[PDB]
Design an enzyme around this catalytic site. Structure first.
Site, PDB file in Angstrom:
ATOM      1  N   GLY A   1       0.841  -1.182   0.000  1.00 55.80           N
ATOM      2  CA  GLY A   1       0.000   0.000   0.000  1.00 55.80           C
ATOM      3  C   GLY A   1       0.881   1.238   0.000  1.00 55.80           C
TER       4      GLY A   1
ATOM      5  N   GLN B   1       3.307   9.931   2.259  1.00 54.03           N
ATOM      6  CA  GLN B   1       4.639   9.351   2.242  1.00 54.03           C
ATOM      7  C   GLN B   1       5.499   9.886   1.112  1.00 54.03           C
ATOM      8  OE1 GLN B   1       2.733   5.203   2.565  1.00 54.03           O
ATOM      9  NE2 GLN B   1       4.790   4.887   3.360  1.00 54.03           N
TER      10      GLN B   1
ATOM     11  N   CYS C   1       6.802  -0.386   7.284  1.00 56.94           N
ATOM     12  CA  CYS C   1       6.457   0.831   6.568  1.00 56.94           C
ATOM     13  C   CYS C   1       7.688   1.252   5.768  1.00 56.94           C
ATOM     14  CB  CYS C   1       6.053   1.911   7.557  1.00 56.94           C
ATOM     15  SG  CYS C   1       5.416   3.418   6.782  1.00 56.94           S
ATOM     16  N   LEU C   2       7.485   1.791   4.577  1.00 59.95           N
ATOM     17  CA  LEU C   2       8.596   2.238   3.758  1.00 59.95           C
ATOM     18  C   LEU C   2       9.200   3.520   4.336  1.00 59.95           C
ATOM     19  CD1 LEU C   2       7.235   1.717   0.147  1.00 59.95           C
ATOM     20  CD2 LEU C   2       8.895   0.282   1.359  1.00 59.95           C
TER      21      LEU C   2
ATOM     22  N   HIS D   1      -3.868   1.210   8.233  1.00 63.27           N
ATOM     23  CA  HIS D   1      -2.478   1.698   8.206  1.00 63.27           C
ATOM     24  C   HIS D   1      -2.350   2.913   7.304  1.00 63.27           C
ATOM     25  CE1 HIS D   1       2.085   1.131   8.260  1.00 63.27           C
ATOM     26  NE2 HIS D   1       1.934   1.962   7.250  1.00 63.27           N
ATOM     27  N   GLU D   2      -2.789   2.763   6.058  1.00 59.42           N
ATOM     28  CA  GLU D   2      -2.741   3.829   5.052  1.00 59.42           C
ATOM     29  C   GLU D   2      -3.563   5.080   5.374  1.00 59.42           C
ATOM     30  OE1 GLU D   2      -0.390   3.695   3.139  1.00 59.42           O
ATOM     31  OE2 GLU D   2       0.049   1.558   3.400  1.00 59.42           O
TER      32      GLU D   2
ATOM     33  N   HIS E   1      -1.749   7.257   7.925  1.00 58.50           N
ATOM     34  CA  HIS E   1      -0.750   8.018   7.190  1.00 58.50           C
ATOM     35  C   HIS E   1      -1.320   9.349   6.714  1.00 58.50           C
ATOM     36  CE1 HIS E   1       3.019   6.098   6.715  1.00 58.50           C
ATOM     37  NE2 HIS E   1       2.582   5.006   6.116  1.00 58.50           N
TER      38      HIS E   1
HETATM   39 ZN   LIG Z   1       3.262   3.044   6.103  1.00 53.00          ZN
END
Ligand SMILES: [Zn+2]
Ligand SMILES: CCCC[C@H](OP(=O)(O)O)C(=O)N[C@@H](CC(C)C)C(=O)Nc1ccc([N+](=O)[O-])cc1
Length: 166
Positions: free
Chosen positions: A45, A50, A90-91, A132-133, A136
């Site tokens: 995702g 981000q 997470c990236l 999660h997204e 963000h």
């Molecule tokens: Zn993330």
């Protein structure tokens, strides 16, 4: 084209994204750019926040075959229930994973790539991914759920990791 993913600590990851006023060609270019970045990084995702674009946009692909594109523009949670959890990554927080408490089932309403609305009932990994997204989008990262001591360790580890990889 691949976009750059911000890592902590970077305050930009904490800016609340604004609602997309009109889904058009530009918004769609961003959507495609986001998918390219997510696939490039092997993520399941990706929230617009981000990649430093402060608008309510999320792209997702929780399939094994990695060919099932889910787009959530201006998501809105309608229902949520049950408890579940997984070793999330997470990236934006390279190499760190932590069990985070999430709702098992989640019902949402959003707009697709063409600006048309839909509702989705999700569970399993898809439901976890969405929560999660969406966090963000409101400047919240998975690490905020942990104790301050663990948070601090995480920041130290990523801070170090980045500096040495430069
Ligand atoms: Zn993330
Ligand atoms: C956690 C929901 C997905 C969010 C993350 O997407 P973004 O960087 O915000 C992601 O792609 N995280 C990966 C790690 C990342 C570094 C590639 C991730 O956490 N994947 C993952 C998939 C399956 C399972 N699982 O337990 O079945 C756990 C975690």
């Amino acid at each position: 084209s691949v976009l750059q993913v911000l890592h902590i600590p970077d305050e930009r990851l904490r800016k609340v994204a604004k609602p997309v006023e009109e889904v058009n060609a530009e918004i769609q270019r961003i959507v495609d750019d986001m998918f390219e970045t997510m696939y490039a990084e092997e993520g399941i995702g990706l929230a617009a926040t981000q990649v430093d674009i402060h608008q309510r946009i999320i792209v997702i692909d929780v399939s094994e075959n990695r060919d099932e594109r889910l787009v959530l523009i201006n998501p809105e949670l309608l229902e949520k229930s049950g408890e579940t959890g997984i070793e999330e990554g997470c990236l934006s927080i390279p190499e760190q994973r932590a069990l985070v408490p999430r709702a098992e089932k989640v019902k949402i309403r959003a707009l697709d790539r063409d600006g048309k609305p839909f509702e989705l009932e999700a569970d399993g990994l898809l439901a976890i991914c969405i929560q999660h997204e969406m966090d963000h989008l409101v400047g919240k990262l998975f690490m905020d759920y942990l104790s301050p001591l663990k948070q601090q360790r995480i920041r130290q580890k990523v801070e170090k990791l980045d500096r040495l990889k430069a």
